[PDB]
Ligand binder design. Structure first.
Ligand SMILES: CN(C)c1cccc2c(S(=O)(=O)NCCCCCCCCCCC(=O)O)cccc12
Length: 272
């Protein structure tokens, strides 16, 4: 088995904007979004290829779970805004949480909040405790640690419930998540007549996103002067590219290397 993750982004606004739900929720399996929810419709909706999967989750039931989470989340926002007494300005709270498994063993988890884009509070499950980054998070910390069972429940969600949901979802999502699309490659060059040649290598049309694209000079990896990535959200493919500068007096042979999980071995594309 490989690495899999289940992650969530919850976002909440203190100030109503027309046609924008105050509370918005997104869930992801690896880099693919599988469900959404908002405060207008108040319904857990599957997304993408999970619209055609049956039995993974009871979405009607999960909508009740999300309503409950909405109320506690928005109450936390309300408390922060009341702490600063800016009850007429626009403010945002974002919570992010999730877990990971590799080789079917838990390999990570996190649970963090941001207020107006800055670190607010995070759960450190190894202590265990909520760690505040902002004066107002002292009040939130104390509500969430008012009884010694709350911390243990928080730890247990990250270490037991989140991985159990992930393992459940994998039995239904394995084909979707194990998609292997191999990269195609394009190599480019340009130069002023007798000056530094710029060589660019681009891998594209690939999934999953993890990849290593690099130039070698006679086998030795070169440091790019420029690099970049692309994600086409629609078809769910990626691209990744690097540029190196080659002195006009450099005669060594350059190749582009592409290491990706869909390949038996790295693609090596010489530039001649
Ligand atoms: C800003 N830079 C680095 C770029 C220039 C041109 C296209 C680029 C694309 S793209 O998605 O539009 N490219 C798709 C190419 C696939 C078809 C192969 C035809 C040859 C492409 C010319 C090489 C190139 O400019 O990358 C994506 C990202 C960066 C691009």
């Amino acid at each position: 088995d490989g690495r899999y993750s289940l992650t969530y982004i919850y976002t909440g606004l203190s100030k109503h904007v027309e046609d924008v739900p105050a509370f918005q929720a997104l869930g992801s399996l690896n880099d693919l979004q599988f469900f959404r929810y908002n405060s207008k419709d108040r319904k857990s909706q599957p997304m993408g290829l999970w619209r055609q999967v049956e039995g993974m989750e009871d979405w009607k039931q999960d909508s009740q779970l999300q309503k409950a989470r909405e109320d506690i989340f928005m109450e936390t926002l309300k408390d922060i805004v009341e702490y600063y007494n800016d009850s007429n300005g626009s403010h945002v709270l974002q919570g992010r949480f999730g877990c990971e498994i590799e080789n079917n063993r838990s390999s990570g988890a996190f649970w963090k909040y941001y207020y107006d884009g800055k670190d607010y509070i995070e759960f450190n499950k190894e202590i265990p405790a909520w760690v505040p980054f902002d004066p107002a998070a002292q009040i939130t910390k104390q509500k969430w640690e008012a009884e010694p069972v709350y911390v243990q429940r928080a730890k247990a969600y990250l270490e037991e419930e989140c991985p159990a949901t992930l393992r459940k979802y994998l039995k239904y999502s394995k084909n979707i998540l194990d998609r292997q699309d191999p990269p195609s490659v394009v190599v480019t060059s340009h130069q002023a007549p007798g000056e530094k040649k710029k060589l660019k290598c681009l891998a594209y049309d690939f999934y999953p996103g993890k990849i290593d694209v690099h130039w070698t000079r006679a086998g030795e990896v070169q440091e790019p002067e420029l690099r970049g990535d692309v994600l086409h959200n629609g078809n769910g493919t990626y691209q990744s590219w690097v540029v190196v500068a080659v002195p006009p007096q450099d005669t060594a042979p350059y190749s582009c290397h592409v290491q990706h999980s869909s390949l038996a071995q790295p693609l090596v594309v010489p530039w001649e």
